[PDB]
Design a protein around this nucleic acid. Sequence first.
DNA 1: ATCAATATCCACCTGCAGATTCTACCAAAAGTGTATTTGGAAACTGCTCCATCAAAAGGCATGTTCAGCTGAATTCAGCTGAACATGCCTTTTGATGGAGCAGTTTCCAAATACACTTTGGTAGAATCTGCAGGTGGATATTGAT
DNA 2: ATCAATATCCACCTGCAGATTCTACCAAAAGTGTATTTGGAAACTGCTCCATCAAAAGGCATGTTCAGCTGAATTCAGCTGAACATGCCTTTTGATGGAGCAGTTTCCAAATACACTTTGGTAGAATCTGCAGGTGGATATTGAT
Lengths: 97, 99, 104, 108, 78, 84, 96, 92
Amino acid sequence: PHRYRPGTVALREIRRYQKSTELLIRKLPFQRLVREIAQDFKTDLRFQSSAVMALQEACEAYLVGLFEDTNLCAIHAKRVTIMPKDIQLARRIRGER
Amino acid sequence: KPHRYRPGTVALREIRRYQKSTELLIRKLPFQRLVREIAQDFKTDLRFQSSAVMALQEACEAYLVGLFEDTNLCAIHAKRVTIMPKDIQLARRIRGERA
Amino acid sequence: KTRSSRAGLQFPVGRVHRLLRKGNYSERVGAGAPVYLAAVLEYLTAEILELAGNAARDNKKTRIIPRHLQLAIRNDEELNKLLGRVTIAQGGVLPNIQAVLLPK
Amino acid sequence: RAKAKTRSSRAGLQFPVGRVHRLLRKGNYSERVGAGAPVYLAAVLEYLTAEILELAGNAARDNKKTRIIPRHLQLAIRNDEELNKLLGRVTIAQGGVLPNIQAVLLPK
Amino acid sequence: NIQGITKPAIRRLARRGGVKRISGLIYEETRGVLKVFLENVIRDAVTYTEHAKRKTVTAMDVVYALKRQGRTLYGFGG
Amino acid sequence: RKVLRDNIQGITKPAIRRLARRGGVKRISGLIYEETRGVLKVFLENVIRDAVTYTEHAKRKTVTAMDVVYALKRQGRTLYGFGG
Amino acid sequence: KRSRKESYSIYVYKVLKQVHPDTGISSKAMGIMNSFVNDIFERIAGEASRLAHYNKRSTITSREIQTAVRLLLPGELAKHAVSEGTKAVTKYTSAK
Amino acid sequence: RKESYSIYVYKVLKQVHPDTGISSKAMGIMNSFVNDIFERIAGEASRLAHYNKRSTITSREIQTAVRLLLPGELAKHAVSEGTKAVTKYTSA
DNA sequence: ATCAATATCCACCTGCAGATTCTACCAAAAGTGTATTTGGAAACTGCTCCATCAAAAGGCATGTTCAGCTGAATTCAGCTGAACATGCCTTTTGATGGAGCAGTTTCCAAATACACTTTGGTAGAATCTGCAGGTGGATATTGAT
DNA sequence: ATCAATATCCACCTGCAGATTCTACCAAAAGTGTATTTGGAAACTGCTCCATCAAAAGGCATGTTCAGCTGAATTCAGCTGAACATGCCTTTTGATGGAGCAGTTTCCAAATACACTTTGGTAGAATCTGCAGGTGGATATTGAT
């Protein structure tokens, strides 16, 4: 049978998602998460569909940027695999922690 | 004996000692000079309240010390004890100063 | 004739002036200000619409969509510095893979 | 008129509710300024000044000096999670850093 | 519900980010971060809503809120 | 007066060394020094450009402490102790 | 022939006496405290202004100041600051 | 009502590329961009007026504000278009 | 490097659907023409506050040695994370409505801006008195047998 | 399992520069009485917004298999820390000359503030750009001489 060597479907996917702009998180799960988090701040809250849209957009943009910075960290440590060690460095430097 | 501390120890002595103070670490005149030169290449015949030079020196040292902190964190992350240009460049790439 | 035409622009010098009095930027607004400002805004809109339109051309579409604005902005050092802390919704990122990751 | 006590005292504060009000009209923050605003604000400013002067005074005590100098304000602010987050992008001139050596660097 | 952000959704975000090989721990870690993010933004969004005596968080609230956070967003409220 | 040239070399090896100490640095590569000056220069340039812009706009020929402050504030490096 | 220069030095010194009456404060550090009070003032008033604006009111009230404090101040500091705020507002209003 | 800069963004679009059109979402992005910049420039011009104890914002403030916010070349060209349109307005 | 075997994107065309774009109406602004106040330009002159010099001292910077130990380079293998087919379910999505709820109007009661006309807070001076350099020994802290 | 070798403290001292407090303008709150808006407070609509309901269809969850990447263990060349001598050049102290702020008044050039008297916002309606396939095209990839 056929079967691509580990690492190659990786790059296929990188090339492919960098190329698009569709939201990468299933929409409903997210809407849910959002309503739950909002809940713990004020109760009985309504959300214009677009407020949820804005949050999802801002989040994904956030996280993607994060991953870029993380990768840079992984690489700097002579690796190809991002680890939590890495994200923590990235944010420690950004200023977020 | 003669006597002579093993390499790395005067290091820590100094870290402990400078972290403890607040005096500006760059001789003052050299800096004033550098400032007047850089200002020069933007507008000519410029005067400087002594305190404008002071503000700059303070902001710069603060800047650079912060930088070195972030750099060290990078060096360490790469399993080293020696900061390299590779490191500063990472730190700034992440901060946003050169993305 | 509109102050917009008396100054040779498309952007509403009429509106920008109000927007400045009503904005609480200061007590009074000189009459040159709304013009200089509407001028700069029009210029910027031009520069970026230009670059995005090219991005649309190369992508073989006749109509500008966000992806094009993102391409237009990130691929332009100066515009990118300017909107460096701004995220275009629906823009995605610039294809870019670090060298070290490419097969042997 | 009867005897005029400052708005500052009528509200039970040290900060000049008189001044803060002007500073708000004259600042182009908006067209008009309700009369409760300068008070609520002078109140918050006074609180913050208190919190930090408190923590700095303690820093002075531990350093064995009776008088507060910037090093003390820096110690006070960085050693306090919430104040530090607040002035996280602010630099105190003459403040130095908090003694801190990463573990990995300490002799074997 | 934060479990709803699935392994492959995080995986995709990572791809678009330039990530080739992804540790196993990442996923959990990521969620950690994602949560903080949201919380922060939503606290602020909601503060805006409250101040407007509304019960509906709007697109514009989210925008203002994100702007406070230094994450300006183009495409919604403006 | 006199020509100003190569002053960034006046930021010496030990002054950069000290800044690195206070920063938590134990072992310092040799290249660092040059690199550092690179960065320092960009920094100053940026701040001084903005400082000076403020001076110009005030039709003054004296860059003041307050200009430097406003300028630093623009840059997202607020500074306490001078102009306010 | 004088040229004025306002300041919050007086009041920072009063509040110093209140908390620590045993303690004093150097020129440079009073400088730092003025920077801090003006910095915060600008943050709170700026934010309150943006607030008034989004909601199409032309007036800034203790309400705006409050939710502005909620937005700028981190958690506990925010709680305690709102506390002292509304307290001083009421004690003022009761002509108290 | 709900104002907008859609009309003018569309006009300038015609000018630079007459062959090209623009989707709802991207016009949204352009409004965001125009309002963003507007606030940046006017804010900075306001701070400028303020530091110098004048109560009025003039084309001058707007200009040095543009110098401060806009990076290099964009700044040059923008100041260009600015003062140009100011004079052409003043000469009635 | 070549031979050959899967999937892999990848242009050329080809049909529609959800959007652009174009038009018809109109309130809600933008524009005008005066008539003043009043912010801020100009032109004095007072007078801080800056650049520049002399000058003498000694703190630090600088250059060369010397080898300690760190970084970098190889080599090796455990296991972790990619890849994939197999199964299962939770997301879409699509209308269909009900209402909880932002958006408007019309009054007014609330509340602030104004409009000239008694200290609080700022600017030198006047005394005090923390604390910056000086030391000298109590405590380390280091690094050689 | 030490103690020479020093640097690090740490406490005691002591004169000066820096704070704290005093003494008097004057710049600026504050008290009062008015002239509007402005911000609500009810009472009603069009709207989004949340609810289901009910499937299919992808997309996600799983357990297996193993290719390769991270970590560790060791070499060892060699870069950078350390100590000393050497004199450079920054620091300090004042000492002015004066460029250039900044005060203070007179005076225009301009923008506010009306009172009224087309642009741009909304909401339908006729094309049409791209969406979505559907193949066949070298394409890239990976197994096998």
